[PDB]
Design a protein around this ligand. Structure first.
Ligand SMILES: *[C@@H]1O[C@H](CO)[C@@H](O[C@@H]2O[C@H](CO)[C@@H](O[C@@H]3O[C@H](CO)[C@@H](O)[C@H](O[C@@H]4O[C@H](CO)[C@@H](O)[C@H](O)[C@@H]4O)[C@@H]3O)[C@H](O)[C@H]2NC(C)=O)[C@H](O)[C@H]1NC(C)=O
Ligand SMILES: NC(=O)CC[C@H](N)C(=O)O
Ligand SMILES: NC(=O)CC[C@H](N)C(=O)O
Ligand SMILES: NC(=O)CC[C@H](N)C(=O)O
Ligand SMILES: NC(=O)CC[C@H](N)C(=O)O
Ligand SMILES: NC(=O)CC[C@H](N)C(=O)O
Ligand SMILES: NC(=O)CC[C@H](N)C(=O)O
Ligand SMILES: NC(=O)CC[C@H](N)C(=O)O
Ligand SMILES: NC(=O)CC[C@H](N)C(=O)O
Ligand SMILES: NC(=O)CC[C@H](N)C(=O)O
Ligand SMILES: NC(=O)CC[C@H](N)C(=O)O
Ligand SMILES: NC(=O)CC[C@H](N)C(=O)O
Ligand SMILES: NC(=O)CC[C@H](N)C(=O)O
Ligand SMILES: NC(=O)CC[C@H](N)C(=O)O
Ligand SMILES: NC(=O)CC[C@H](N)C(=O)O
Ligand SMILES: NC(=O)CC[C@H](N)C(=O)O
Ligand SMILES: NC(=O)CC[C@H](N)C(=O)O
Ligand SMILES: NC(=O)CC[C@H](N)C(=O)O
Ligand SMILES: NC(=O)CC[C@H](N)C(=O)O
Ligand SMILES: NC(=O)CC[C@H](N)C(=O)O
Ligand SMILES: NC(=O)CC[C@H](N)C(=O)O
Ligand SMILES: NC(=O)CC[C@H](N)C(=O)O
Ligand SMILES: NC(=O)CC[C@H](N)C(=O)O
Ligand SMILES: NC(=O)CC[C@H](N)C(=O)O
Ligand SMILES: NC(=O)CC[C@H](N)C(=O)O
Ligand SMILES: NC(=O)CC[C@H](N)C(=O)O
Ligand SMILES: NC(=O)CC[C@H](N)C(=O)O
Ligand SMILES: NC(=O)CC[C@H](N)C(=O)O
Ligand SMILES: NC(=O)CC[C@H](N)C(=O)O
Ligand SMILES: [Fe+3]
Ligand SMILES: [Fe+3]
Ligand code: NA
Length: 302
């Protein structure tokens, strides 16, 4: 009965033309509010691409109210904190602005490009670490390249510094559950597919240090993947767009893909995570309210 609950939504950032949201973003705002009202949520994780298509200009940019506050304004969301990280489109604009906005909106929590969250599951001593990454400063901005793959970071020292931080943090983490989150995927069968930078540089750390799951967006669909070590991959990038691409199906090792939903007639959806002392589970919920897939992930034990 002790439980931690949160929604993970990716790539919800509306549009820069009025009315500054899509039909899909509005459906997911309503669907998330209903989920929060009916099942509860202790917080919401944004998996990046918070403001399409070029982010915000500064912390008083009106897109913060137009695409974020006014869209996710249903009353059940009133007191629900958001923990945010950046995607590639955010980085085309002013990312310091989205960090500074944390001081303007109470529920907006974005203290740094990368940072560590730590929770105690209520009514228990079980602990959860969530490391929020900036995969754009780690790997590069996909929008810098015709390939739309982050081929190289713009600043080597900045990339190597975050990698060192992740190394040291994951080797020291004592929590029962360790989640890692970033915008770009490790594995994905869809339009961008796997990020070579993360597969080479992040995935060995996730494996070595017994991470429960990596959460991401960036590909505009819903996927669950799991490798032969039981490391889970929660891809939730369907807050604003639905891309049915299977372009990179053959770039993901056979068997890793356990669930995929990208139907273009869908309004999108999101992932709902529940963590108890017993186990972690993730439910993929469509913007229509239908449960699409649910699976459990183990307690790492520590
Ligand atoms: C990326 O985003 C950053 C975060 O918004 C932004 O940094 C902010 O820049 C603004 C504008 O320079 C700063 O806001 C002003 O601070 C002064 C104090 O010097 C206030 O007096 C001032 O008053 C307002 O601004 C007008 C100034 O021309 C004034 O006439 C108006 O009437 C009004 O009084 C503003 O409050 C703010 O402190 C900065 N914040 C931080 C956290 O640095 C960056 O500029 C932006 N970068 C880029 C490249 O766009
Ligand atoms: N807000 C809540 O419902 C917190 C209680 C939660 N059901 C728990 O057992 O920890
Ligand atoms: N803010 C809310 O009322 C959502 C549910 C509550 N945060 C819980 O965890 O039970
Ligand atoms: N929306 C704009 O004005 C620019 C968009 C940006 N060039 C992109 O590739 O997404
Ligand atoms: N009324 C509004 O501007 C919507 C956001 C509101 N402050 C909330 O937390 O729900
Ligand atoms: N070095 C850092 O992690 C801070 C980066 C800076 N706040 C930015 O995103 O513009
Ligand atoms: N949640 C956090 O611990 C935020 C850490 C952030 N890097 C800071 O020191 O400002
Ligand atoms: N805001 C939170 O609850 C997470 C903070 C986390 N305990 C840290 O110090 O890094
Ligand atoms: N190590 C922790 O954070 C939780 C305590 C211990 N894993 C237990 O529940 O038995
Ligand atoms: N870290 C930086 O150089 C800033 C982001 C830049 N887009 C990158 O390639 O990483
Ligand atoms: N127009 C584009 O290709 C988007 C990228 C953006 N102009 C940049 O500075 O990287
Ligand atoms: N600005 C550019 O010329 C491209 C930047 C890119 N990060 C690279 O070094 O390949
Ligand atoms: N070395 C320090 O004093 C802090 C550096 C800082 N973390 C940065 O990369 O921007
Ligand atoms: N859908 C997108 O954002 C771009 C994907 C495009 N099909 C490609 O060349 O990879
Ligand atoms: N990451 C992407 O956007 C797709 C790149 C693809 N692997 C190519 O080389 O064309
Ligand atoms: N064990 C495996 O086959 C995984 C693939 C490997 N991580 C790669 O670089 O593609
Ligand atoms: N070109 C690449 O694939 C990266 C370098 C080298 N092949 C490796 O082991 O990853
Ligand atoms: N939750 C888990 O234990 C996943 C397995 C662990 N991440 C590993 O690869 O070693
Ligand atoms: N079909 C495409 O070329 C892109 C689809 C787009 N992402 C959407 O929201 O539907
Ligand atoms: N390349 C871009 O400007 C982003 C495309 C946008 N995400 C779409 O699906 O239509
Ligand atoms: N090998 C395949 O059939 C898929 C490759 C994928 N189209 C790419 O651009 O890398
Ligand atoms: N060779 C494979 O199947 C993995 C993908 C390979 N890294 C490529 O870019 O083509
Ligand atoms: N098939 C389609 O064209 C889907 C788009 C439509 N606006 C929707 O959100 O469902
Ligand atoms: N007839 C169908 O299956 C399409 C409706 C489906 N529930 C959707 O909109 O995603
Ligand atoms: N969080 C968990 O995986 C424990 C079970 C959880 N109550 C569920 O909905 O499946
Ligand atoms: N199998 C499904 O698509 C979900 C069953 C049911 N409609 C639910 O959402 O709870
Ligand atoms: N069975 C389902 O998929 C419904 C939702 C799921 N049981 C949850 O706890 O959120
Ligand atoms: N057996 C099922 O219907 C799958 C369970 C899960 N709740 C789902 O709706 O997808
Ligand atoms: N998981 C799958 O193989 C398909 C996904 C869907 N949840 C189903 O049960 O049919
Ligand atoms: Fe996106
Ligand atoms: Fe993206
Ligand atoms: Na805040």
């Amino acid at each position: 009965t002790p439980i931690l609950r949160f929604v993970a939504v990716g790539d919800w950032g509306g549009v820069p033309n009025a009315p500054f949201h899509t039909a899909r973003e509005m459906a997911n705002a309503k669907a998330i509010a209903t989920t929060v009202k009916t099942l509860g949520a202790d917080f919401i994780l944004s998996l990046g691409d918070n403001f399409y298509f070029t982010g915000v200009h500064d912390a008083k940019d009106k897109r913060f109210q137009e695409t974020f506050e006014d869209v996710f304004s249903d009353p059940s969301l009133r007191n629900v904190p958001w923990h945010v990280l950046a995607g590639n489109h955010d980085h085309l604009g002013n990312v310091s602005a989205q960090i500074a906005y944390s001081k303007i909106s109470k529920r907006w929590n974005f203290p740094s490009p990368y940072y560590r969250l730590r929770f105690k599951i209520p009514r228990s001593n079980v602990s959860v670490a969530i490391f929020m990454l900036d995969t754009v400063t780690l790997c590069g901005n996909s929008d810098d390249f015709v390939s739309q793959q982050p081929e190289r970071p713009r600043n080597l020292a900045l990339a190597r510094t975050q990698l060192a931080w992740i190394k040291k943090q994951l080797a020291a983490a004592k929590e029962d559950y360790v989640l890692v989150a970033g915008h770009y995927p490790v594995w994905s069968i869809a339009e961008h597919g796997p990020t070579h930078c993360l597969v080479k540089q992040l995935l060995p750390l996730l494996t070595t240090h017994k991470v429960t799951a990596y959460l991401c967006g960036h590909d505009h669909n819903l996927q669950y993947l799991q490798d032969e070590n039981g490391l889970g991959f929660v891809l939730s990038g369907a807050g604003n767009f639905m891309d049915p691409s299977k372009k990179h199906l053959r770039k993901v090792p056979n068997g890793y893909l356990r669930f995929h939903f990208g139907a273009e007639n869908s309004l999108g959806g999101f992932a709902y995570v529940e963590i108890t002392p017993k186990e972690m589970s993730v439910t993929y919920i469509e913007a229509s309210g239908k449960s699409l897939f649910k699976t459990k992930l183990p307690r790492r034990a520590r």
